[PDB]
Symmetry: none
Subunit: 262 residues, 2 copies
Amino acid sequence: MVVLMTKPGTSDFVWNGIPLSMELNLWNIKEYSGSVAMKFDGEKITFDADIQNLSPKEPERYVLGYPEFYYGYKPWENHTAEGSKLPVPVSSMKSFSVEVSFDIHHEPSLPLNFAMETWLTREKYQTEASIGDVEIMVWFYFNNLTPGGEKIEEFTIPFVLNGESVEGTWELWLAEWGWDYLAFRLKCPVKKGRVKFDVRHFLDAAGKALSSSARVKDFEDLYFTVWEIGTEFGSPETKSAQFGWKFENFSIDLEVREHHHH
Amino acid sequence: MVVLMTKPGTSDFVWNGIPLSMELNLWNIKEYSGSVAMKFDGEKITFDADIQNLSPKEPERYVLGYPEFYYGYKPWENHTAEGSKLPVPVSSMKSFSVEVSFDIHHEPSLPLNFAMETWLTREKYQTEASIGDVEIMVWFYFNNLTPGGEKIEEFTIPFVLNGESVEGTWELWLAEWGWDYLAFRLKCPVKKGRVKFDVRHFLDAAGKALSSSARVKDFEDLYFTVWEIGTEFGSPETKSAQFGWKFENFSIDLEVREHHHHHH
Ligand SMILES: [Br-]
Ligand SMILES: [Br-]
Ligand SMILES: [Br-]
Ligand SMILES: [Br-]
Ligand SMILES: [Br-]
Ligand SMILES: [Br-]
Ligand SMILES: [Br-]
């Protein structure tokens, strides 16, 4: 299964029996010159960009794009690969373990992160996120890039790094924009390696942080729609972007609480 | 050569052609029960503690002990293993690279660090440290423990981590006690791995930080007496300690400055 993209768009693929979507996502790019290439070869997914003459569509949104791949339904795209077990309500999720090997390369000054995210929505199949909805980001890497909003808390969350169980300190950045923006940023970023973690830990911390919010009142009743894996890049000042990534050894294990458990 | 200790004290040993001293150091423990064991087997050095009924000698000093090994002369113990190249004046040191593989294990609540250190003295073989002398610690790991004094600066200092060159951010903690206490703490602690770094880089940052000191007058003229490698542990509320460590693949490389003979 060789799936290749050289311009913005979305393609579905199957990796280790998991149905997924790849998105060469340049959402906030107005214009550009150069090259972009996304490829899935059956064993791995890679992305490379060597783009110039950049301008943002909306300078206030800061980042330029998010080349990624995802499991589940992405609301902003009205899209899901066939056979995905997502969306599921947050209350029915016992655990959601994600495993991936990664390598991030970039031109040194480039604002960039290695971020994973979900959209928590009131309705199962929304086409946007608004007041009452949540965007939860998990940053494993960052370079000359700070999350949006303000740092409100710090959480200790375990994960497996290169087969070793480690306790990470995750900064929580909150913003009350069109929707609720929550970004958990690892204090000690990792550019390459293999990580294994349970998304449930980030859902617990986010529910606890939103426990006094007048906007997100029924946290556990929201639908966990997707799990996106990619790199946000750029700033309103970025005119040239040279970077890429490689993802390998990918696996997801979703545990849903049902009547036969216990 | 097998070196084994099961109570506080010192023993000399030779590792990969390097003369060293091991110290089962419980310096601030007034009393204890349970087991302590330090061992060198030719290839590695290990320590294990399963101690209870702990009480400090001086509660104000906070930590309970520092089981360690060292290269050179430790002033407080008036001791050196035969054949060490230290003490040397700081000005003479071009480079002092240290390499070690380490694994620290401990009960989760235990106050503990993986800290390396030197004592910078005015005279070559002092028996203690006082005003004008410096204590410089390098913390690669910490658990439920903060260095003494206050955070006065942050420094970018490179090191090799698991064969990859990295640039650590180190907090500098400074305290004006009986001597000057300086502690460089890695913002991103590592309890297991392989590290290679140059002590000269920490001395350069310690020299800058102490540039306008009324106590420390001439940094480069002081003697670099020792390089201690161990784990500080405990607190005045610590009643029992369960932890251990293992150190392997140890090497040091001292590069001294060359002299040019003047005829006057
Ligand atoms: Br295409
Ligand atoms: Br690059
Ligand atoms: Br961390
Ligand atoms: Br997991
Ligand atoms: Br233990
Ligand atoms: Br660091
Ligand atoms: Br180095």
